[PDB]
Coordinates of C-alpha atoms and ligand atoms in Angstrom, one line a residue:
Chain W
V1 CA 3.9 -14.2 96.6
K2 CA 1.1 -15.7 94.8
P3 CA 1.3 -18.9 93.4
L4 CA -0.3 -18.3 90.3
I5 CA -0.2 -22.0 88.6
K6 CA 0.3 -21.3 85.1
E7 CA -3.1 -20.9 83.4
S8 CA -2.1 -23.2 80.3
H9 CA -1.9 -26.4 82.6
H10 CA -4.8 -28.2 84.3
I11 CA -4.3 -30.4 86.9
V12 CA 0.5 -14.2 100.2
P13 CA 1.5 -17.9 99.8
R14 CA 1.5 -17.2 103.9
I15 CA -2.7 -17.0 102.7
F16 CA -2.8 -20.4 101.8
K17 CA -1.4 -21.6 104.6
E18 CA -3.2 -20.0 107.1
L19 CA -6.2 -20.3 105.2
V20 CA -5.4 -24.0 104.9
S21 CA -4.8 -25.1 108.4
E22 CA -8.0 -22.8 109.0
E23 CA 5.1 -24.4 106.3
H24 CA 7.9 -26.2 104.8
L25 CA 5.9 -28.7 102.6
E26 CA 3.6 -25.5 101.3
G27 CA 6.8 -24.0 100.8
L28 CA 8.1 -26.7 99.1
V29 CA 5.4 -26.8 96.4
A30 CA 5.4 -23.0 96.3
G31 CA 9.2 -23.4 95.6
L32 CA 9.3 -26.3 93.5
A33 CA 7.3 -24.4 90.8
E34 CA 10.3 -22.7 90.5
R35 CA 10.6 -25.4 87.5
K36 CA 9.0 -22.9 85.5
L37 CA 5.5 -23.9 86.6
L38 CA 4.5 -20.8 88.2
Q39 CA 3.7 -17.1 87.8
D40 CA 3.6 -14.0 89.7
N41 CA 0.9 -12.3 89.2
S42 CA 1.8 -9.4 90.9
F43 CA 3.2 -7.6 87.8
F44 CA 0.9 -5.5 85.6
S45 CA 2.7 -3.9 82.9
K46 CA 2.8 -0.4 82.3
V47 CA 2.2 0.1 78.4
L48 CA 0.1 -2.4 77.7
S49 CA -4.2 -1.8 78.1
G50 CA -6.7 -3.5 80.1
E51 CA -8.2 -4.7 76.7
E52 CA -4.8 -5.3 74.9
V53 CA -3.6 -7.7 77.8
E54 CA -7.0 -9.3 77.5
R55 CA -7.1 -9.8 73.1
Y56 CA -3.4 -10.7 73.4
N57 CA -3.7 -13.0 76.6
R58 CA -4.4 -16.8 75.2
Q59 CA -0.8 -16.3 73.3
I60 CA 0.5 -14.4 76.4
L61 CA 0.3 -18.1 78.3
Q62 CA 1.8 -19.4 75.2
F63 CA 5.1 -17.3 75.7
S64 CA 4.7 -18.2 79.5
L65 CA 4.5 -21.6 78.5
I66 CA 8.2 -22.0 77.4
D67 CA 9.4 -18.4 78.9
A68 CA 13.1 -19.1 77.5
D69 CA 14.1 -15.5 78.2
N70 CA 13.0 -15.1 82.1
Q71 CA 10.5 -12.3 82.2
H72 CA 7.1 -11.6 83.0
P73 CA 4.5 -12.8 80.3
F74 CA 3.7 -9.5 79.4
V75 CA 7.6 -7.9 79.0
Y76 CA 6.7 -10.3 75.5
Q77 CA 4.0 -8.8 74.2
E78 CA 5.8 -5.8 75.1
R79 CA 8.5 -6.2 72.5
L80 CA 5.7 -7.1 69.9
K81 CA 4.8 -4.0 70.9
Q82 CA 7.5 -1.9 70.8
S83 CA 8.6 -3.5 67.1
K84 CA 8.7 -1.5 64.0
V85 CA 7.7 -4.3 61.3
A86 CA 8.4 -3.2 57.6
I87 CA 7.1 -5.7 54.6
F88 CA 8.0 -4.3 50.6
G89 CA 5.2 -6.8 48.8
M90 CA 1.4 -6.6 49.2
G91 CA 0.0 -8.7 47.6
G92 CA 0.6 -12.6 48.0
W93 CA 2.5 -14.0 51.1
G94 CA 2.7 -10.0 51.9
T95 CA -0.6 -9.5 53.2
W96 CA -1.1 -12.7 55.3
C97 CA 2.2 -11.5 57.3
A98 CA 0.4 -8.0 57.8
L99 CA -2.9 -10.1 58.8
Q100 CA -0.9 -12.5 61.3
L101 CA 1.6 -9.4 62.5
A102 CA -1.2 -7.4 63.2
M103 CA -3.4 -9.8 65.1
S104 CA -0.4 -10.9 67.7
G105 CA 0.2 -7.2 68.9
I106 CA 2.9 -5.7 66.9
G107 CA 3.7 -2.5 67.4
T108 CA 4.1 -0.8 63.5
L109 CA 3.4 -2.1 60.3
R110 CA 4.9 -0.4 57.5
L111 CA 3.8 -1.4 54.1
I112 CA 5.1 -1.0 51.0
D113 CA 3.4 -1.6 47.4
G114 CA 2.5 0.7 44.2
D115 CA -0.5 -1.6 43.6
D116 CA -4.5 -1.7 43.3
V117 CA -6.8 -4.6 44.3
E118 CA -8.0 -6.8 41.9
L119 CA -10.7 -8.8 41.7
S120 CA -8.1 -11.6 41.1
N121 CA -6.5 -10.9 44.0
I122 CA -9.5 -11.9 46.2
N123 CA -8.8 -16.0 46.0
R124 CA -5.5 -15.6 47.9
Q125 CA -5.1 -11.8 49.2
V126 CA -6.5 -12.0 52.7
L127 CA -6.7 -8.5 53.1
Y128 CA -8.2 -7.3 50.4
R129 CA -12.3 -7.9 50.1
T130 CA -14.8 -7.9 47.2
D131 CA -16.1 -4.3 48.2
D132 CA -11.7 -3.4 48.4
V133 CA -11.2 -3.7 44.6
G134 CA -10.0 -0.4 42.7
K135 CA -8.7 0.6 45.9
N136 CA -4.8 0.9 45.9
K137 CA -3.8 -2.2 47.9
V138 CA -2.1 -0.5 50.8
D139 CA -5.2 1.3 51.4
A140 CA -7.0 -1.3 51.5
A141 CA -4.7 -3.1 54.0
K142 CA -5.0 -0.3 56.5
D143 CA -8.3 -0.2 56.2
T144 CA -8.6 -3.7 56.9
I145 CA -5.8 -4.8 59.8
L146 CA -7.2 -1.7 61.9
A147 CA -10.7 -3.6 62.1
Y148 CA -9.2 -6.9 63.5
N149 CA -6.9 -5.0 65.8
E150 CA -7.1 -1.3 66.5
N151 CA -3.9 -0.7 68.7
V152 CA -1.9 -1.5 65.4
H153 CA -0.5 1.2 63.9
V154 CA 0.2 1.6 59.8
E155 CA 1.9 3.2 57.7
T156 CA 1.7 3.1 54.2
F157 CA 3.4 3.6 51.4
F158 CA 2.3 3.3 48.2
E159 CA 5.1 3.3 45.6
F160 CA 6.9 0.3 44.3
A161 CA 10.5 -0.5 45.3
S162 CA 12.9 1.2 43.3
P163 CA 16.4 0.5 43.5
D164 CA 17.3 4.5 44.5
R165 CA 19.2 4.0 47.9
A166 CA 18.0 7.1 48.9
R167 CA 14.5 6.3 49.0
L168 CA 14.4 3.1 50.3
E169 CA 16.5 4.4 53.7
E170 CA 13.0 6.4 54.0
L171 CA 11.0 3.7 53.3
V172 CA 12.8 1.1 55.4
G173 CA 13.1 4.9 58.1
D174 CA 13.2 3.2 61.4
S175 CA 11.8 -0.2 61.1
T176 CA 13.0 -2.8 63.9
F177 CA 12.1 -5.9 61.1
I178 CA 12.0 -6.6 57.7
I179 CA 10.0 -9.1 55.5
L180 CA 11.1 -9.5 51.9
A181 CA 11.2 -12.0 48.9
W182 CA 14.2 -13.7 46.5
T183 CA 19.3 -5.4 43.3
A184 CA 16.3 -3.2 45.6
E185 CA 16.5 -6.3 47.2
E186 CA 20.0 -6.2 47.5
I187 CA 20.5 -2.5 48.2
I188 CA 17.6 -2.9 51.2
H189 CA 19.7 -6.0 52.5
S190 CA 23.0 -3.6 52.9
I191 CA 20.5 -0.6 54.3
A192 CA 19.3 -3.3 57.5
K193 CA 22.8 -4.2 57.8
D194 CA 24.3 -1.1 58.6
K195 CA 21.1 -0.1 61.0
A196 CA 21.8 -3.4 62.8
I197 CA 17.8 -4.5 61.5
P198 CA 17.1 -8.2 61.6
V199 CA 16.1 -9.3 58.1
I200 CA 13.8 -12.7 57.2
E201 CA 13.0 -13.8 53.6
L202 CA 10.9 -15.9 52.1
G203 CA 9.4 -17.4 48.5
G204 CA 8.0 -20.1 46.9
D205 CA 4.9 -21.5 44.8
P206 CA 1.5 -23.7 45.8
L207 CA 4.1 -26.9 45.0
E208 CA 6.7 -26.4 47.8
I209 CA 7.4 -23.5 49.7
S210 CA 10.6 -22.1 51.8
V211 CA 11.1 -19.6 54.6
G212 CA 14.4 -18.0 54.2
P213 CA 16.6 -17.3 56.4
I214 CA 16.7 -14.8 59.1
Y215 CA 19.7 -12.3 59.6
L216 CA 19.7 -10.5 62.8
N217 CA 22.5 -8.2 62.1
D218 CA 23.7 -7.3 64.7
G219 CA 27.5 -8.2 64.1
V220 CA 28.3 -12.0 65.4
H221 CA 26.4 -13.4 62.5
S222 CA 27.6 -13.9 59.1
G223 CA 24.9 -11.4 56.7
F224 CA 23.8 -10.7 53.7
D225 CA 27.0 -10.3 52.0
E226 CA 28.8 -13.7 52.3
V227 CA 25.7 -15.8 50.8
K228 CA 25.6 -13.1 48.3
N229 CA 28.4 -14.8 46.4
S230 CA 15.7 -31.9 30.1
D231 CA 17.3 -30.6 33.1
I232 CA 14.5 -30.2 36.0
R233 CA 17.2 -27.7 37.4
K234 CA 17.7 -25.9 34.3
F235 CA 14.6 -24.9 33.7
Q236 CA 13.8 -24.1 37.6
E237 CA 17.3 -21.0 37.0
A238 CA 15.8 -20.2 33.7
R239 CA 12.2 -19.6 35.4
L240 CA 13.4 -17.7 38.3
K241 CA 15.2 -15.5 35.6
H242 CA 12.3 -14.7 33.9
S243 CA 13.3 -15.7 30.8
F244 CA 10.3 -16.4 28.7
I245 CA 9.1 -16.6 25.0
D246 CA 6.0 -15.7 25.1
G247 CA 4.9 -13.0 22.3
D248 CA 1.4 -11.6 22.6
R249 CA 0.0 -13.9 24.6
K250 CA -0.7 -12.7 28.4
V251 CA 0.2 -15.3 31.1
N252 CA -0.4 -15.1 34.4
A253 CA 1.3 -16.6 37.8
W254 CA -0.4 -19.2 39.1
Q255 CA -0.9 -19.0 43.0
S256 CA -3.6 -19.7 45.6
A257 CA -4.4 -19.6 49.1
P258 CA -3.3 -22.5 51.0
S259 CA 1.0 -21.9 50.2
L260 CA 0.6 -18.4 51.1
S261 CA -0.7 -18.8 54.2
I262 CA 1.3 -21.7 55.5
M263 CA 4.3 -19.5 54.7
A264 CA 3.1 -16.5 56.1
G265 CA 2.8 -18.7 59.5
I266 CA 5.7 -20.0 59.1
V267 CA 7.0 -16.7 58.7
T268 CA 5.1 -14.7 61.6
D269 CA 6.3 -17.3 64.3
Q270 CA 9.8 -17.2 64.1
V271 CA 9.5 -13.3 63.4
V272 CA 7.8 -13.4 67.1
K273 CA 10.1 -15.9 68.7
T274 CA 13.0 -13.1 67.3
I275 CA 11.5 -10.4 68.6
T276 CA 10.6 -11.6 72.0
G277 CA 13.1 -14.5 72.7
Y278 CA 9.8 -16.2 74.3
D279 CA 11.6 -19.1 72.6
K280 CA 14.6 -20.3 70.0
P281 CA 13.9 -19.3 66.1
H282 CA 15.2 -22.1 64.3
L283 CA 15.2 -20.0 61.2
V284 CA 18.9 -17.7 61.6
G285 CA 21.1 -19.3 58.7
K286 CA 18.9 -21.5 57.6
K287 CA 16.4 -22.1 54.8
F288 CA 13.6 -24.5 55.4
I289 CA 12.2 -25.9 52.1
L290 CA 8.9 -28.1 51.9
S291 CA 6.7 -30.0 49.3
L292 CA 2.5 -29.6 49.2
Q293 CA 2.6 -32.2 47.4
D294 CA 4.6 -35.2 49.0
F295 CA 5.1 -33.1 52.6
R296 CA 9.6 -34.1 52.5
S297 CA 11.4 -31.4 54.2
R298 CA 15.2 -30.5 53.8
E299 CA 17.0 -27.6 55.9
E300 CA 19.7 -25.2 54.0
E301 CA 22.4 -23.7 56.1
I302 CA 23.6 -20.1 54.9
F303 CA 25.6 -19.9 57.9
Chain J
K1 CA -2.6 -22.8 27.6
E2 CA -2.6 -19.7 29.1
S3 CA -1.7 -21.4 32.6
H4 CA 2.2 -22.6 30.6
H5 CA 4.6 -20.1 30.2
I6 CA 7.6 -20.7 27.7
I7 CA 10.7 -21.4 29.2
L8 CA 13.8 -20.2 27.8
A9 CA 16.9 -22.4 29.4
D10 CA 20.1 -20.5 28.3
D11 CA 21.6 -23.6 25.9
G12 CA 18.5 -23.1 23.7
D13 CA 15.8 -25.7 24.9
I14 CA 12.4 -24.7 25.7
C15 CA 10.0 -25.8 28.1
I16 CA 5.9 -25.0 28.0
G17 CA 5.0 -25.0 31.5
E18 CA 6.6 -23.7 34.9
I19 CA 7.0 -27.3 36.5
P20 CA 7.0 -30.5 34.8
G21 CA 4.7 -31.1 35.4
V22 CA 5.0 -33.4 32.4
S23 CA 5.2 -30.0 30.5
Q24 CA 6.6 -30.9 27.1
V25 CA 11.0 -30.4 26.5
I26 CA 11.4 -29.8 23.2
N27 CA 14.9 -30.0 23.0
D28 CA 17.6 -28.5 20.4
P29 CA 14.5 -27.0 18.5
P30 CA 14.4 -25.5 15.0
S31 CA 15.9 -22.0 15.1
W32 CA 12.3 -20.9 13.6
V33 CA 10.1 -22.6 16.7
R34 CA 11.0 -19.0 19.3
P35 CA 9.5 -17.5 16.9
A36 CA 7.0 -19.7 16.0
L37 CA 5.0 -20.3 19.6
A38 CA 6.3 -16.6 20.9
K39 CA 3.1 -15.7 17.8
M40 CA 0.6 -18.2 18.3
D41 CA -1.6 -16.7 20.3
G42 CA -4.7 -15.8 18.6
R43 CA -1.9 -21.1 7.7
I44 CA -2.5 -17.8 10.3
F45 CA 1.0 -17.6 11.0
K46 CA 3.4 -18.8 7.9
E47 CA 2.3 -15.6 7.2
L48 CA 3.7 -14.0 9.7
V49 CA 7.5 -15.3 9.4
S50 CA 7.3 -13.2 6.0
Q51 CA 13.5 -19.0 8.1
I52 CA 10.7 -22.0 8.2
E53 CA 8.4 -24.9 6.0
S54 CA 4.7 -25.2 6.0
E55 CA 4.3 -28.8 6.7
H56 CA 7.2 -28.3 9.5
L57 CA 4.7 -25.4 11.1
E58 CA 1.4 -27.6 11.4
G59 CA 3.2 -30.6 13.0
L60 CA 4.6 -28.3 15.4
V61 CA 0.7 -27.2 16.0
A62 CA -0.1 -31.1 15.7
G63 CA 2.6 -32.1 18.0
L64 CA 1.2 -29.3 21.1
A65 CA -2.6 -30.6 20.5
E66 CA -2.2 -34.6 21.9
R67 CA 0.4 -33.4 24.1
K68 CA -2.6 -31.5 25.8
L69 CA -1.1 -28.3 26.0
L70 CA -2.8 -26.4 23.4
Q71 CA -5.9 -24.6 24.6
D72 CA -9.9 -24.7 24.2
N73 CA -11.4 -21.5 23.0
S74 CA -14.3 -23.7 22.1
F75 CA -15.3 -24.2 26.1
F76 CA -17.6 -22.4 28.4
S77 CA -18.6 -23.0 31.8
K78 CA -22.2 -23.0 32.7
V79 CA -21.7 -24.0 36.5
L80 CA -19.7 -20.9 37.0
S81 CA -20.5 -16.9 36.8
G82 CA -18.2 -14.4 35.1
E83 CA -17.3 -13.4 37.4
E84 CA -16.3 -16.5 39.9
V85 CA -14.1 -16.8 36.7
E86 CA -12.7 -13.6 37.0
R87 CA -11.6 -14.1 40.8
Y88 CA -10.7 -17.7 40.9
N89 CA -7.9 -16.7 37.8
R90 CA -5.0 -17.4 39.4
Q91 CA -5.9 -20.9 40.8
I92 CA -7.4 -22.3 38.2
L93 CA -4.0 -21.9 36.1
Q94 CA -3.0 -24.0 39.3
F95 CA -5.5 -26.4 38.0
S96 CA -4.6 -26.3 34.3
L97 CA -0.7 -26.9 35.4
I98 CA -1.1 -29.7 36.7
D99 CA -4.3 -31.1 35.4
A100 CA -4.3 -34.8 36.7
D101 CA -7.6 -36.1 36.1
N102 CA -7.3 -34.5 32.5
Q103 CA -9.7 -31.8 32.7
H104 CA -10.1 -28.4 31.2
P105 CA -9.4 -26.1 33.7
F106 CA -13.2 -24.7 34.8
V107 CA -13.9 -28.5 35.4
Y108 CA -11.9 -28.5 38.2
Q109 CA -13.9 -25.5 39.9
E110 CA -16.8 -26.6 39.2
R111 CA -16.1 -29.5 41.0
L112 CA -15.5 -27.1 44.1
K113 CA -18.5 -25.2 43.9
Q114 CA -20.5 -28.2 43.5
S115 CA -19.0 -28.9 47.1
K116 CA -20.4 -28.8 50.5
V117 CA -18.1 -29.1 53.4
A118 CA -18.8 -28.8 56.7
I119 CA -16.7 -27.9 59.5
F120 CA -17.6 -28.6 63.2
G121 CA -16.6 -26.0 65.6
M122 CA -15.7 -22.5 64.9
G123 CA -12.0 -22.0 67.1
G124 CA -8.8 -21.4 66.0
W125 CA -9.4 -24.3 63.2
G126 CA -11.8 -23.7 62.6
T127 CA -12.0 -20.4 61.7
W128 CA -9.1 -20.3 59.4
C129 CA -10.3 -23.6 57.3
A130 CA -13.9 -22.0 56.9
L131 CA -11.9 -18.5 55.2
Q132 CA -9.6 -20.4 53.3
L133 CA -11.7 -22.9 51.6
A134 CA -14.4 -20.0 51.0
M135 CA -11.8 -18.1 49.3
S136 CA -11.0 -20.9 46.7
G137 CA -15.1 -21.0 45.8
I138 CA -15.9 -23.9 47.8
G139 CA -19.8 -24.1 46.7
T140 CA -21.8 -24.4 50.6
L141 CA -20.1 -24.1 54.0
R142 CA -22.1 -25.3 57.0
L143 CA -21.2 -23.7 60.2
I144 CA -21.6 -25.5 63.4
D145 CA -20.7 -23.2 67.2
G146 CA -22.9 -22.9 69.9
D147 CA -20.4 -19.9 71.4
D148 CA -20.0 -16.2 70.8
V149 CA -17.3 -14.1 70.2
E150 CA -14.8 -13.1 73.0
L151 CA -12.2 -10.7 73.0
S152 CA -9.6 -13.2 73.6
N153 CA -11.1 -14.8 70.5
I154 CA -9.6 -12.1 68.1
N155 CA -6.1 -12.9 68.3
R156 CA -6.1 -16.3 66.3
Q157 CA -10.2 -17.0 65.0
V158 CA -9.8 -14.7 61.6
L159 CA -13.5 -14.9 60.9
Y160 CA -14.0 -12.2 63.9
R161 CA -13.1 -8.8 64.1
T162 CA -13.7 -6.4 67.0
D163 CA -17.0 -5.1 66.2
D164 CA -17.7 -9.2 66.1
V165 CA -17.4 -9.1 69.8
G166 CA -20.5 -10.3 71.8
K167 CA -22.3 -11.7 68.6
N168 CA -23.2 -15.3 67.7
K169 CA -19.7 -17.1 65.9
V170 CA -21.9 -18.7 63.4
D171 CA -23.6 -15.5 62.3
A172 CA -20.4 -13.5 62.8
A173 CA -18.6 -16.2 60.6
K174 CA -21.4 -15.8 57.7
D175 CA -21.0 -11.9 57.5
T176 CA -17.1 -12.4 57.2
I177 CA -17.7 -15.1 54.9
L178 CA -20.0 -13.6 52.6
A179 CA -17.9 -10.1 52.4
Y180 CA -14.7 -12.1 51.2
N181 CA -16.5 -14.6 48.8
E182 CA -19.9 -13.2 47.8
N183 CA -20.7 -16.6 45.7
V184 CA -20.1 -19.4 49.0
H185 CA -24.0 -20.4 50.4
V186 CA -23.4 -20.4 54.4
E187 CA -26.0 -22.5 56.2
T188 CA -25.4 -21.9 60.0
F189 CA -26.5 -24.2 63.3
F190 CA -26.0 -22.0 66.6
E191 CA -25.4 -25.0 69.0
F192 CA -22.9 -27.4 69.9
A193 CA -22.6 -30.6 68.6
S194 CA -24.0 -33.5 70.8
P195 CA -23.5 -36.9 70.7
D196 CA -26.7 -38.2 69.5
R197 CA -27.3 -39.4 65.8
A198 CA -30.7 -38.3 65.0
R199 CA -29.4 -34.3 65.2
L200 CA -25.7 -35.7 63.5
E201 CA -27.1 -36.7 60.4
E202 CA -29.1 -33.9 60.7
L203 CA -26.0 -31.4 60.9
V204 CA -23.8 -33.3 58.4
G205 CA -26.9 -33.0 56.1
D206 CA -26.0 -33.4 52.3
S207 CA -22.5 -32.1 52.4
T208 CA -19.7 -33.6 50.3
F209 CA -16.8 -33.7 52.9
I210 CA -16.0 -32.9 56.4
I211 CA -13.8 -31.1 58.3
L212 CA -13.5 -31.9 62.3
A213 CA -10.7 -32.3 64.9
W214 CA -8.5 -34.6 66.3
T215 CA -17.7 -38.3 72.0
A216 CA -19.9 -36.7 68.6
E217 CA -17.0 -37.3 66.9
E218 CA -17.1 -41.1 66.8
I219 CA -20.5 -41.0 65.7
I220 CA -19.7 -37.7 62.8
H221 CA -16.7 -40.6 61.7
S222 CA -20.0 -43.1 61.7
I223 CA -22.7 -41.0 59.8
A224 CA -19.5 -40.5 56.9
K225 CA -18.8 -43.7 56.7
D226 CA -22.1 -44.9 56.1
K227 CA -22.9 -41.9 53.2
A228 CA -19.8 -42.1 51.4
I229 CA -18.0 -38.7 52.7
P230 CA -14.5 -37.6 53.2
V231 CA -13.2 -36.8 56.2
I232 CA -10.2 -35.3 57.2
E233 CA -8.9 -34.4 61.2
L234 CA -6.6 -32.5 62.1
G235 CA -4.8 -30.7 65.7
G236 CA -1.9 -29.5 67.6
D237 CA -0.5 -26.5 69.4
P238 CA 1.8 -23.7 68.7
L239 CA 4.7 -26.1 69.8
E240 CA 3.8 -29.0 67.4
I241 CA 1.1 -29.3 64.3
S242 CA 0.0 -32.7 63.0
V243 CA -3.1 -32.7 60.0
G244 CA -5.0 -35.8 58.5
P245 CA -5.6 -38.0 57.8
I246 CA -8.1 -37.9 55.6
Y247 CA -10.6 -40.7 55.1
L248 CA -12.2 -41.7 51.6
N249 CA -14.7 -43.7 53.1
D250 CA -15.2 -45.1 49.7
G251 CA -15.3 -48.5 50.5
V252 CA -11.9 -49.4 48.5
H253 CA -9.9 -47.9 52.0
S254 CA -9.2 -49.2 55.6
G255 CA -12.2 -46.8 57.8
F256 CA -11.7 -45.2 61.1
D257 CA -13.4 -48.4 62.5
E258 CA -10.3 -50.7 61.7
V259 CA -7.9 -48.5 62.6
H260 CA -10.9 -36.5 84.1
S261 CA -11.6 -34.6 87.1
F262 CA -9.5 -31.8 87.8
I263 CA -8.1 -30.5 91.1
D264 CA -8.3 -27.0 89.4
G265 CA -9.4 -25.0 92.1
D266 CA -10.6 -21.1 91.7
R267 CA -8.1 -20.3 88.6
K268 CA -9.7 -20.6 84.9
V269 CA -7.5 -22.8 82.6
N270 CA -7.2 -21.4 78.9
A271 CA -6.3 -22.6 75.7
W272 CA -2.8 -21.3 75.2
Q273 CA -2.9 -20.2 71.3
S274 CA -1.7 -17.8 68.4
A275 CA -2.7 -17.3 64.8
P276 CA 0.7 -18.8 63.2
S277 CA 0.4 -22.2 63.8
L278 CA -3.6 -22.1 62.9
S279 CA -2.8 -20.7 59.2
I280 CA -0.3 -23.5 59.0
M281 CA -2.6 -26.4 59.1
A282 CA -5.4 -24.7 57.8
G283 CA -3.9 -24.4 54.5
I284 CA -2.3 -28.0 54.5
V285 CA -6.1 -29.2 55.1
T286 CA -7.1 -26.7 52.8
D287 CA -4.7 -27.6 50.2
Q288 CA -5.2 -31.7 50.3
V289 CA -8.9 -30.9 50.7
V290 CA -8.7 -28.8 47.3
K291 CA -6.9 -31.7 45.6
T292 CA -9.4 -34.4 46.9
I293 CA -12.8 -33.2 45.7
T294 CA -11.0 -31.5 42.3
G295 CA -8.9 -34.1 41.7
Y296 CA -6.2 -31.8 39.7
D297 CA -3.3 -33.1 41.9
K298 CA -3.4 -36.4 44.0
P299 CA -3.2 -35.7 47.8
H300 CA -0.4 -36.8 50.0
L301 CA -2.6 -37.0 53.7
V302 CA -4.9 -40.2 52.8
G303 CA -4.4 -42.7 55.5
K304 CA -1.1 -40.5 56.6
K305 CA -0.7 -38.4 59.2
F306 CA 1.7 -35.4 59.0
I307 CA 4.0 -33.9 61.9
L308 CA 5.7 -30.7 62.2
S309 CA 7.4 -29.2 65.0
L310 CA 7.2 -25.9 64.6
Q311 CA 10.1 -25.4 66.7
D312 CA 13.2 -27.1 65.4
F313 CA 10.8 -28.1 62.1
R314 CA 11.2 -31.5 61.9
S315 CA 8.7 -33.8 60.5
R316 CA 7.3 -37.5 60.5
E317 CA 4.8 -39.4 58.6
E318 CA 2.6 -41.8 60.1
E319 CA 0.7 -44.1 58.6
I320 CA -3.0 -45.1 59.6
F321 CA -3.8 -47.2 56.7
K322 CA -2.6 -48.2 53.3
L323 CA -4.7 -47.6 49.9
Ligands
LIG401 NI1 -2.4 -3.3 38.9

């Protein structure tokens, strides 16, 4: 037993005693450290590398700070490397999630997108650089993802999500987590329910963002189905339904980087808490809504 | 006005703009407007309807004029290039949507290219702010830092990639920023901020905005008050984040003034961090800095500090001074 006062905090066990005089009282400080302030470095991981433990170090101290699940700090990092996350959009919120997940040591990224990089994507889509223009988005994403973290394995699917139940189970494949917005959404949710895969939603704009509920899909939780069934409101409703009278005028969606990174950050944090259990995740059954104008927020229960 | 959608409510009412936003709302429009507006990108139009009346068509066009909803094809930017207007397009749409300072959309972006932001420290909070600012078309970035990239910086400091290990942070930073946005000028100072005002006024230089963390800090603040330079504070951890207040330093708001050893032993005590907390913090900052510089929309954080738990998502404001 070797007292590692958790490298987060500023200020043999038999070794410190003998080195000190050079017993219950030191025994007293060591033990009372069981108030979750002490490490037992005596454990090394049989999965993670020398490089990885170094690279993942500063967040590993963070898992160990809360240690909700009572594990050695690498076990948490282990639960990320064992994870497989599928992302069904690869511009907007999609590249920021991919980015921050790869940086965090997520095991696998399954990326799905049928688009290609345009110069107008560069202001907000963080995985694509000026020289990536003209590439297919998923190819650029993987290229970029591995330059950041070479231990992340990336599976890329150059296609859109069609409402084909046979194709989606292939696209979902053996995922451990799913990230998506807002029938194809519904077919996936269903796939997710069948394979017991946690699913997190999200969506919004520069004025206000939300990071939708988590569905654990372990059983013992409500699941997607249960949720399935001048007014500032009516034009809200009409817009999400895409009914626009634009005609031959070409109108584009107004988006910029700040709003995406905020929800992408809320999303990645919540996903990391779920996978690892280093701390409890708020967003199970809740929707967090935050104005980016006046910073008022609110919660929504789904179950 | 290519920022605005023309929305069709179920009952048939129309709203020109996605998020009024002070978008015009036409209630119970004549049958003729849905085909009218639908053809207004390009006298001319009355032709196409060949049920509607000629004078009734001009008033409609008349109206859309004083409502500031109609496009100005005659305006070209002498500041922005062909490439920038492309790359900045969608955020340009976002400015055109709220349009608080009543300007042509290009003008707002111009106000960004003309800006110079100095960032003190390229740690976690530091790297994300530089990035999103560069992406957003900030004119010039002044990076101040004496460190070099470590393998442990790679999990949270986003401007640094694996091949960047061992390099100077400000130089690795500049290489990365320029891969993302070649239009941003980057001035780099491989040094830490000493509490010498003689150097600090040199490091600040002709900055137009300052970002720093929650001492040198107080001199930078004094330099800022003296030169009328906005300063935004920030800070927190993986558990709760805070951003602001912003100090306008215009003389019509209260100023910054108005408001040991460790028994460490042989263990190395480190900063506990992961990326998610930083992105939220830089995005709140960047949005607030962009709104302040350009004025396309009003910034909340002037004189206020916003605090958000990342555990249970309770937030709270703290006033630091009144406008
Ligand atoms: Ni395309």
